[PDB]
Design a protein around this nucleic acid. Sequence first.
RNA 1: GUAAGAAGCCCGGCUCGCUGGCGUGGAGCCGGGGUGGAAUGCGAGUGCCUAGUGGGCCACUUUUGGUAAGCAGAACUGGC
RNA 2: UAUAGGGGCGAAAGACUAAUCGAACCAUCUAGUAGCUGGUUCCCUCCGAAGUUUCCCUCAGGAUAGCUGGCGCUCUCGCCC
RNA 3: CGGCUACCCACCCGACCCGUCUUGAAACACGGACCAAGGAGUCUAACACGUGCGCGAGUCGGGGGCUCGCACGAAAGCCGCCGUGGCGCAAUGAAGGUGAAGGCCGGCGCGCUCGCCGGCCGAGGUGGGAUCCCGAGGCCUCUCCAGUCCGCCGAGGGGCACCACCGGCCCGUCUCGCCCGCCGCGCCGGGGAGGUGGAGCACGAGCGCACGUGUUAGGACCCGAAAGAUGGUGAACUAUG
RNA 4: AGGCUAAAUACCGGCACGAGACCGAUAGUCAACAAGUACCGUAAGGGAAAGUUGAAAAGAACUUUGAAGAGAGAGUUCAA
Lengths: 187, 147, 68, 103, 52, 51
Amino acid sequence: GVDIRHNKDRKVRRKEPKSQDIYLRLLVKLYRFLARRTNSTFNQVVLKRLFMSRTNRPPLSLSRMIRKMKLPGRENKTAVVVGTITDDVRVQEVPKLKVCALRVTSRARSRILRAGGKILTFDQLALDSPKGCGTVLLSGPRKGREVYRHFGKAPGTPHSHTKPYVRSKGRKFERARGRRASRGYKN
Amino acid sequence: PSRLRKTRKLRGHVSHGHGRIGKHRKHPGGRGNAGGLHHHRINFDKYHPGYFGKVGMKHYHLKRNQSFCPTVNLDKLWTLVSEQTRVNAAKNKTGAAPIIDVVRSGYYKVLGKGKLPKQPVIVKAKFFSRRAEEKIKSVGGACVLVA
Amino acid sequence: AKSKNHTTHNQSRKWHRNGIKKPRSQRYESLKGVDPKFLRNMRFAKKHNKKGLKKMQANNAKAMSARA
Amino acid sequence: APSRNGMVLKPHFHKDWQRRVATWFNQPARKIRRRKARQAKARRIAPRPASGPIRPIVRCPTVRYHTKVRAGRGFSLEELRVAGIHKKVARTIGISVDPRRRN
Amino acid sequence: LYGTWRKAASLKSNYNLPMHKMINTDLSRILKSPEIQRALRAPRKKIHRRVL
Amino acid sequence: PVRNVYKKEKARVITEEEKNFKAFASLRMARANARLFGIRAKRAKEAAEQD
RNA sequence: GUAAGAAGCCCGGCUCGCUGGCGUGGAGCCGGGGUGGAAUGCGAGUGCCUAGUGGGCCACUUUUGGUAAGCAGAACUGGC
RNA sequence: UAUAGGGGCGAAAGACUAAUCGAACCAUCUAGUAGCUGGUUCCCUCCGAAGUUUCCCUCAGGAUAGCUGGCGCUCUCGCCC
RNA sequence: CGGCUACCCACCCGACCCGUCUUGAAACACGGACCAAGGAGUCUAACACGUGCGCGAGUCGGGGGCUCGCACGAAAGCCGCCGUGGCGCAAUGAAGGUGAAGGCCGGCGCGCUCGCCGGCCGAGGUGGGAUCCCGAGGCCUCUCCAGUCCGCCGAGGGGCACCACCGGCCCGUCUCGCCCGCCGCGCCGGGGAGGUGGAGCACGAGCGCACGUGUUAGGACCCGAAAGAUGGUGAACUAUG
RNA sequence: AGGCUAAAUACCGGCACGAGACCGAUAGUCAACAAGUACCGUAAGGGAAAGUUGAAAAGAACUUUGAAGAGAGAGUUCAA
Ligand SMILES: [Mg+2]
Ligand SMILES: [Mg+2]
Ligand SMILES: [Mg+2]
Ligand SMILES: [Mg+2]
Ligand SMILES: [Mg+2]
Ligand SMILES: [Mg+2]
Ligand SMILES: [Mg+2]
Ligand SMILES: [Mg+2]
Ligand SMILES: [Mg+2]
Ligand SMILES: [Mg+2]
Ligand SMILES: [Mg+2]
Ligand SMILES: [Mg+2]
Ligand SMILES: [Mg+2]
Ligand SMILES: [Mg+2]
Ligand SMILES: [Mg+2]
Ligand SMILES: [Mg+2]
Ligand SMILES: [Mg+2]
Ligand SMILES: [Mg+2]
Ligand SMILES: [Mg+2]
Ligand SMILES: [Mg+2]
Ligand SMILES: [Mg+2]
Ligand SMILES: [Mg+2]
Ligand SMILES: [Mg+2]
Ligand SMILES: [Mg+2]
Ligand SMILES: [Mg+2]
Ligand SMILES: [Mg+2]
Ligand SMILES: [Mg+2]
Ligand SMILES: [Mg+2]
Ligand SMILES: [Mg+2]
Ligand SMILES: [Mg+2]
Ligand SMILES: [Mg+2]
Ligand SMILES: [Mg+2]
Ligand SMILES: [Mg+2]
Ligand SMILES: [Mg+2]
Ligand SMILES: [Mg+2]
Ligand SMILES: [Mg+2]
Ligand SMILES: [Mg+2]
Ligand SMILES: [Mg+2]
Ligand SMILES: [Mg+2]
C-alpha cells in the first residue's frame, strides 16, 4: 500500500466542451492555441469560458454593459463578453463602444449600429488583439438565474428567505401552518 | 432512447440498482402524500411550511375576470409607442407632448419605477400609483384618467 | 425481538471524512441581535457621517497633504 | 413516498383513466373532411359567398375585454328596422337576425 | 423568400437570416497571418525524454 | 367584420389645471366617497329625526 | 477550548438623537504610516442533484446486570 | 316432486349441499392488496459506503440528518518571501 | 523444423457447489436431474435539477384556417388585422386595496431630532476579488544620438462574476408624531420618523424543444395470497318431507 | 311548468376498404391448419396441439429375401 490519503485527485473540470457545435469547436481550437502560445491569462479565461456550459455563460444586458464601460478609464477599451448580448428596453441612449461577443441578438446589433458602433466576433478579436490588450472582460448575472432563489438551508426554519416550491401563488396554497403565529407556530 | 437509458447498462447486476437488502417492493411509505401529519412531518414541515390549515375569507364563485389589472412600468412606458415619436417630440419642437395610451397596448395600471427622461408626455390609464404620478409631474408631463 | 438500542461507535470516523472544519467567520460579522438602543444610535451615526463628513474631512485631507 | 425539496404532487389519475382515453389520431383526417365540407359547401351554394351571413360589430362584456371588438351574431331588430327592411327578408338577403339583442 | 442579412424576408413575415458565428474562418490563414505570429512565444520542440 | 379601429390623439400642448389637479388623490377620494355614500345618507336621516 | 498578527498595530481628524461634570465614554466613518511575526505538512473554498444505508459483530483497555457464558448492555480506537 | 348459498336441509356431528363446506361452484370487478419470501439477463475503467441522531400505533418499515457518487464553478501555481 | 492451441494423457502444488437472506454459508439453511426457446425497471402525465440547441424581454402554434384530387403527403410549408391564450416581465395583503430612485452641489425656512426650492448625475457604499490599464527602475558588441522593438516590474489606478456586511425602496402590522390636499370640508383622503413579518426591488432571463437522473399516480420491475362485491348454474351422490 | 329541428360531434359491433420504423408459428386474436373444432364438466362454463417434399409427383417400375412390416439391388431428379 502507498497512500493512506484518500483518492480525490481527479478534478471535475471540463476538458472538452460538451457541445457538438462546429463553430464552438473551431473557437476552442484557436483559443487553446493562443492560451498555450501567448502566455496571457486573458486567453486562459476566454478559453475556460468557451468550455463553460449553457447555464454559466449567462446573457449580458446592454444597460449593464454600458454601465461597466462608463467607469473611469475604459472608453477606448473594448468590452469583451463571452456569452450573448440582449438588447435592453430600459435605457434610451447608447454610446459608441466596441463589443466583441458571441451571438448578439438582432435588435441589439440594430441599436448598436444605430449608435454607430462596431461589433466583432472572436476571430476578428484574435486578429486584432491576440494578448487581448485594451480589452475589458465582462460577466453575466449568474445568481440572478431564478433557480438560485430556491437554494438555501431550508425553505422555512431560521427564516430561510428561500421561496418554497408550489403551484400557484395564491391563498390556500402553503400559507397556514408555520407561516403565521395564530396557526401553530412561526418558523 | 433505450440505448442511452441507464437500464440497458444495468444488466448483469443482480439487484438492478436498488440494493439487495432494501429490495424496492411496491410502496414502502404509502402512496402519494401519506402521513402528512403522522410520519412524514419532518419532510412536510422543513420542506413545505404552511401546508395544513385555513387562512382567509372564503370567496365563492370567483372570477379571474373582474380583478384583471395588469401593470406597466415607467421603464416600459416608452416602448408602447414607436421611438420615432419620442425622437421627434424630443427634438426641441415646441411645448407640445405626445399622448401614450396604455389601454391600447392592454395595460390598465401604471406603476412607478425609476429613470423617466425629462421629455414631457401625457399618459392615459385607468389607475395610477402616486409614485408614477409624482414622476410624471416631476418630468413635467401630466396625468390623465379614462373610463 | 430485541435490538441494539443506542451507540456512538463508528461516528468519529464518519465525522472526520470531509473534516470537522470551522464555521468560516468572514469579515464584518452579522450585526443582528445587538442592543437596539445602540443600533438606533449607530444608524443615525452612519447617515450623518455620510451627510456632514464631506467638507471638514476634505479640509483635513488637504491639511495633512500640505504637512506631508 | 416523498423525498428532498420537491413540489407537492396531486395528479388526477386514481380514476381508471386508461379505459376512457380518446386520442387525436384522426385529426388530419378531420382536417381533410372539413376542407372537403367547405369546398362542397362552396360548390353547392351558388354565387352566394362562403361564410354567407354578415355579422355585426360587437364589444365584449368584461372589465377585461371591453376595449376590444368582436364579430357578433345578429343585427338586433331595432337596428334592422332602422335599416328599413323586413325581418325574414333579411334572412333571405343574408343579413343575420338575432332578436334577443338589445341596444 | 429568405432575404439577405441586410433586408428582411418579404414572403416569410418575421424571419431574418441567422446570425453568423465566426466571420472568416480559415484557421490556417488566421494562424499564419502576421498579427498572431508577432505575439507567439517560440516553437519549443526538444523532447527531453526519461534519463536513466 | 373586426377592423379594430385605432385612434391617434396625435399631439397637444400641455396646459395647466390638469397637471396641477389630476393627482392620485382623486381616485382615493372618489373610492371612499363611493364606499361611504350610504352611511352619510343614514346620518342625514338621523339628524332629521333628532329634530 | 482559545491565542500564536495586515481583518493586525499606531497616528490624526469628522458624525452621533446613545452615554454624560468635562471635545466624557463607546461605536461608526475618513485619511496617513511601517507585513520578516512558533514547528511541520499540504492546493483550498463553494453550490446543486441523489443512490444505497436506517437487523450488526469481534478484539486491547475501561466498564454496568449476572455465579458465568461463544450472555445481555456502554465508552475510545482498529478490524470483519 | 319441493326446498339454492349467508341460503337450503340437519334424531345436532358446524355434518351434508356433485371427490370442495366453520359459508358450494362458474365468470367478472381483477394484472385486486401486501411494510412479506423468490428472481431480477453484455464487458471494461474509475470512485466507493452504512447498519448511527430525531420523529412516527414506529421496533422486519419510512421521513430526516450523517456517510457516497456525479455535475461543475470560483480562486491558487509555474519566474529576503 | 516451429506451433499456441477449448484434443487427450501423465506429474507437482494449490484447490469444498453455485444463487441469496444473513454479523456469519462448504454447511446437517433453502432452490437447482439434464437440455433448447420464452422470461423481468417499459409507457404516459406531472414536477425538480443538470445538459445541448434556437430565439431573446420576450417566447410558443401544440387549436384552427390557407395550397390541385398525386406514392413517400396522417409528411412538409405558410398565417401575425389568427398571440385569444399559456409561462415570464411585480410583489404583497385574509381582504377592501396598495404597489419598488436615489446620489452630488447651491439656497431658504430657528439647517430645529425639520421640510421646501434650484441645477447636474444616476441604481449607493465598505472589504476581498480573475482580468485590464499606468509605471519608477532593470537589461540587449567602441564611444554620442536614435526609434519601433524586447521583457521583468516594486508600486499605483478603474474593477466583472460572486461572497460578507451596512445603507436605501415597496407591501402588511405595531409605536410615536405633526402637516398638506378639497367634484366638496367628513367617524374624507394624502403624507412623515422609527422596530418588525414577506416566497420582494436594488438594470431584467425566461420560453420552447430534446436528452439524462430522481420522485409520485397509474396493473408500473415480474409472480404470489386467506378475503369482498355483482350476476348466474346445480338436490344424478347426500340431508328431509 | 306544451312541442319540433340539419350541422360541427362519439363509434373496439357490422359492411367492404387502404396503409404500417408492428409479430413472424412457444410471437401475433385462443383460432396462419376441418377453431370456438377435437375434448373436460350434469351445467353455468372451461378450451388445445397442429405451417414448410420437390421446379415438376417425376411418390421409387422391375428384380430379389422375408408370412408381412422391413430390406438389398435397380430407377426419379441437381439432391433422396
Ligand atoms: Mg502499489
Ligand atoms: Mg479505493
Ligand atoms: Mg457492483
Ligand atoms: Mg428501499
Ligand atoms: Mg438496530
Ligand atoms: Mg425513499
Ligand atoms: Mg394534499
Ligand atoms: Mg384503481
Ligand atoms: Mg438508486
Ligand atoms: Mg438519505
Ligand atoms: Mg431493515
Ligand atoms: Mg497496562
Ligand atoms: Mg456483546
Ligand atoms: Mg444477541
Ligand atoms: Mg357468501
Ligand atoms: Mg362433499
Ligand atoms: Mg403484478
Ligand atoms: Mg391475483
Ligand atoms: Mg425504527
Ligand atoms: Mg462530493
Ligand atoms: Mg428478511
Ligand atoms: Mg441468525
Ligand atoms: Mg453461498
Ligand atoms: Mg440449498
Ligand atoms: Mg431439490
Ligand atoms: Mg433466451
Ligand atoms: Mg433546462
Ligand atoms: Mg394577451
Ligand atoms: Mg373489508
Ligand atoms: Mg358474498
Ligand atoms: Mg346473489
Ligand atoms: Mg335425487
Ligand atoms: Mg319551450
Ligand atoms: Mg321544451
Ligand atoms: Mg347532429
Ligand atoms: Mg419453427
Ligand atoms: Mg395461441
Ligand atoms: Mg411443389
Ligand atoms: Mg445442392
